[PDB]
Amino acid sequence: GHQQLYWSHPRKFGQGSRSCRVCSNRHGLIRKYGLNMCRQCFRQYAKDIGFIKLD
């Protein structure tokens, strides 16, 4: 709560630095092509994004 230690621990890197841009989860995150998307969320939004399972 005090400012010196509330955010003292850095997260410049690692798995905690990155989160899903739809649900803030940190597991199964796709970082390719700047996606930054939780994978279940990406499977949900793939059609709107433009990804098609041609085969």
């Binding site: 092509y33 996606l35 939004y45 433009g50």
Partner: protein
């Protein structure tokens, strides 16, 4: 350009914008007969045209709500003042739209109608509004712990191959 981003990342970013815009508009105009949206992007400006059933309700009083929406998108995405435009257009033959019927049946079920009664009404609307076939599935539990699935189908449906993408509309 180094200041610019790669074209592959650009198209991904565009689809991210389209997906998020569609979801936000869905959660905002859920009761207002939301149907869909499209964007035309040009170097001069980017245009957002929202397709809906009740545009006179989507519009605010003297366009107040549309002004409300056209500012909040620019504030979200850091858009130029004069290069973001917002339009509302009605949907032709909304009885053929999967989303518009889905929202309407959602409201009917919130209204507490009998599920068989509400599904038959929307199915009749679709069939008499012109469609080779239509099918609605309602799953969930009512008046008990156990869940049920209700299937209301008439006409013809297809499930396999490429034609299912541009023939059968889902919601």
């Amino acid at each position: 350009m180094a200041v610019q981003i790669s074209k592959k990342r650009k198209f991904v970013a565009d689809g991210i914008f389209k997906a998020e815009l569609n979801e936000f508009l869905t959660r905002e105009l859920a009761e207002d007969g939301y149907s869909g949206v499209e964007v035309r992007v040009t170097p001069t400006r980017t245009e957002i045209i929202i397709l809906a059933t009740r545009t006179q309700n989507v519009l605010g009083e003297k366009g107040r709500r549309i002004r409300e929406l056209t500012a909040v998108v620019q504030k979200r995405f850091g858009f130029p003042e004069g290069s973001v435009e917002l339009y509302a257009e009605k949907v032709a033959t909304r009885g053929l739209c999967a989303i518009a019927q889905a929202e309407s049946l959602r409201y009917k079920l919130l209204g507490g109608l009998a599920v068989r009664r509400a599904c038959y009404g929307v199915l009749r609307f679709i069939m008499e509004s012109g469609a080779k076939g239509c099918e609605v599935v309602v799953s969930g539990k009512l008046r008990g712990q156990r869940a049920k699935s209700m299937k209301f189908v008439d006409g013809l449906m297809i499930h396999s191959g490429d034609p299912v993408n541009y023939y059968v509309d889902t919601a």
